[PDB]
Amino acid sequence: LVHVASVEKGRSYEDFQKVYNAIALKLREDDEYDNYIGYGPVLVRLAWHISGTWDKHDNTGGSYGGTYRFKKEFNDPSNAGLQNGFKFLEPIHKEFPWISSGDLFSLGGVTAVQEMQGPKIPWRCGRVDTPEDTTPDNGRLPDADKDAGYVRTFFQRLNMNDREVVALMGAHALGKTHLKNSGYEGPGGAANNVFTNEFYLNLLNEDWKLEKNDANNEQWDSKSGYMMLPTDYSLIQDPKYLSIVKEYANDQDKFFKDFSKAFEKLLENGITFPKDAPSPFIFKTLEEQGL
Ligand code: HEM
Ligand SMILES: Cc1ccnc(N)c1
């Protein structure tokens, strides 16, 4: 199974910048969502979950086909809550019907990171919608109740190595866990709609207490009112992961650089880009455009 990127016919950088801008303007407008967090975090999570179904062994799943639009995937228990992100993107898709679903969902994540003052994330177009029978079965996204060995093995299916895993997990500074979605509750830190290295600082510097929450699941809770999943906490239990956590806690610029690379890789897994495809796009923020 090969998925070759195919640019939406007649479209170029400036067209995709317009889609970026529409997402970014709506992010600005819809500032009350989830008790004033806004939609940035859920859009990042959506971009990751539509990509994280990939299996490197047979090229099933991945962002290419836009299959989250089909009920089997939309209704995956692992995706509970992401319907909010999908609904946010609906008016964007109506305004720009020419964009593919996978391009829209992945671009939502890029837009969110940049508009939350994160690093620039280069982004490539050309994902092509595939039919309902190409939708991956549920169960390919990761469990949260597990240890470092589970995390390492899981992410190897996505061709991610230790540095990429630790960098990607820094997105857990964003947003919050919701008991009704996942059986976990609380934020990872204070600045949960601005992209920073706070996840790593909090892992290292907070006083964490293992507790069983109201859904009967174990999570690590700090005196400051933050939480970590068991899979998050595993990053300071495993010696190799811990070394990288320290690096990113000490150097936000390095975290930004590594996150940008890993997130682009995640969003592009499974896609073959022809050697004459456009170079990756770097979208201007609204601020950079005076909008
Ligand atoms: C071992 C891997 C991971 C596990 C087990 C995991 C698990 C979870 C869980 C249980 C939630 C809470 C969902 C809810 O209750 O609404 C969550 C939220 C989130 N996840 Fe992860 N995650 C993983 C990796 C990632 C990665 C790689 C990214 C992106 C780079 C990511 C981005 C996010 C974001 C931004 C949220 C907040 C969403 C919101 O506020 O609505 N996660 N994750
Ligand atoms: C919001 C969030 C998600 C996952 N892990 C955390 N520590 C925080």
UniProtKB/Swiss-Prot annotation:
GO cellular component, one term: mitochondrial matrix
Residues recorded with modification Phosphotyrosine: Y150
One example of a Gene Ontology biological process annotation: response to reactive oxygen species
Chain residues that bind heme b: H172
Leading EC class: oxidoreductase
Domain of life: Eukaryota
Principal subcellular localization: mitochondrion
GO molecular function, one term: cytochrome-c peroxidase activity
Keyword Transit peptide among record annotations: yes
Active-site residue numbers: H49, G188
Keyword terms of this UniProt record: Heme, Hydrogen peroxide, Iron, Metal-binding, Mitochondrion, Organic radical, Oxidoreductase, Peroxidase, Phosphoprotein, Transit peptide
Subcellular compartments: Mitochondrion matrix; Mitochondrion intermembrane space
Signal peptide annotation: none
PTM info: CCP1 precursor is processed by the rhomboid protease PCP1, which cleaves the N-terminal hydrophobic transit peptide. The m-AAA protease (composed of YTA12/RCA1 and YTA10/AFG3) is required for CCP1 maturation: m-AAA protease promotes membrane dislocation of the CCP1 transmembrane segment within the transit peptide to ensure the correct positioning of CCP1 within the membrane bilayer, allowing intramembrane cleavage by PCP1.
Function of the protein: Destroys radicals which are normally produced within the cells and which are toxic to biological systems.
Oligomer status and interactors: Forms a one-to-one complex with cytochrome c.
Name of protein: Cytochrome c peroxidase, mitochondrial
Organism listed in the record: Saccharomyces cerevisiae (strain ATCC 204508 / S288c) (Baker's yeast)
